[PDB]
Amino acid sequence: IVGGYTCGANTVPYQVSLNSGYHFCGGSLINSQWVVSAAHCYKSGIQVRLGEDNINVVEGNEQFISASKSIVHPSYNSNTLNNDIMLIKLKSAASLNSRVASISLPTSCASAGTQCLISGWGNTKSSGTSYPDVLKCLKAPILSDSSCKSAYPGQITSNMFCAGYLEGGKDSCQGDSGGPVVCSGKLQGIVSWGSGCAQKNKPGVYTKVCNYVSWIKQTIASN
Numbered sequence: 001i002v003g004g005y006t007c008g009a010n011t012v013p014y015q016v017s018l019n020s021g022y023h024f025c026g027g028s029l030i031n032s033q034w035v036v037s038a039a040h041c042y043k044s045g046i047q048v049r050l051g052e053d054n055i056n057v058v059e060g061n062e063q064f065i066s067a068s069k070s071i072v073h074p075s076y077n078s079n080t081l082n083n084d085i086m087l088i089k090l091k092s093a094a095s096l097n098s099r100v101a102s103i104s105l106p107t108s109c110a111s112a113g114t115q116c117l118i119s120g121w122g123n124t125k126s127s128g129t130s131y132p133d134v135l136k137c138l139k140a141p142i143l144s145d146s147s148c149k150s151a152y153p154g155q156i157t158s159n160m161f162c163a164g165y166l167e168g169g170k171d172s173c174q175g176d177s178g179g180p181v182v183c184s185g186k187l188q189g190i191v192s193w194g195s196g197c198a199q200k201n202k203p204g205v206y207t208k209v210c211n212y213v214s215w216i217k218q219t220i221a222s223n
């Protein structure tokens with residue numbers, strides 16, 4: 001997250017870290033046994049880490065649970081990033097409280113103009129590298145689809161939205177991929193892609209979760 005603030009320990013209780021020896025992508029807890037992330041984050045050998053704040057220190061609220069199954073969207077296209085969504089089932093159910101909670105899936109798609117909260121452990125620099133150990137937050141609006149398409153001609157599909165600032169300086173970034181964009185207390189987006197980070201006229205591009213709710217629900221009921 002570039003240009004964001006330090007969220008505060010377990011203020012974002014649905015936020016997970018995906019670990020394979022090291023944090024590689026975020027994700028969101030949607031019930032006590034399922035996580036939704038970016039299909040471009042898929043690996044073998046995931047451990048999900050819940051209740052995290054500092055990812056390098058054991059501070060007391062963590063639950064570390066291995067994935068039993070990962071399901072990438074049927075139509076994910078890794079050259080265009082279209083359908084950049086994946087479901088991860090945990091080997092055991094999480095224990096849910098105030099500091100480890102699930103986020104609701106949306107009933108409606110959120111509109112341009114709505115202010116959202118994006119969070120992760122990604123890089124905090126638009127030039128060079130510096131990865132934080134504690135969870136970073138950013139508040140950012142959803143952009144209009146015209147503005148989005150004019151930023152990324154030929155690249156945006158129906159299953160994407162942009163959010164952020166065309167002026168640059170505040171964005172999500174590498175490492176923040178798969179993590180949540182929550183608007184009015186519902187999961188609206190997934191950190192998907194961008195051109196660099198926090199650059200001028202290159203906002204972040206986010207998977208549009210409200211187009212997948214049927215697919216999530218069906219999948220969860222059958223697996």
Ligand SMILES: *[C@](O)(Cc1ccc(C(=N)N)cc1)C(=O)O
Binds near residue numbers: 176
């Ligand atoms: C991602 O975090 C890659 C990524 C995602 C989003 C942005 C953006 N500028 N909003 C840049 C890069 C990963 O796969 O690690």
Ligand SMILES: [Ca+2]
Binds near residue numbers: 053058059
């Ligand atoms: Ca920790």
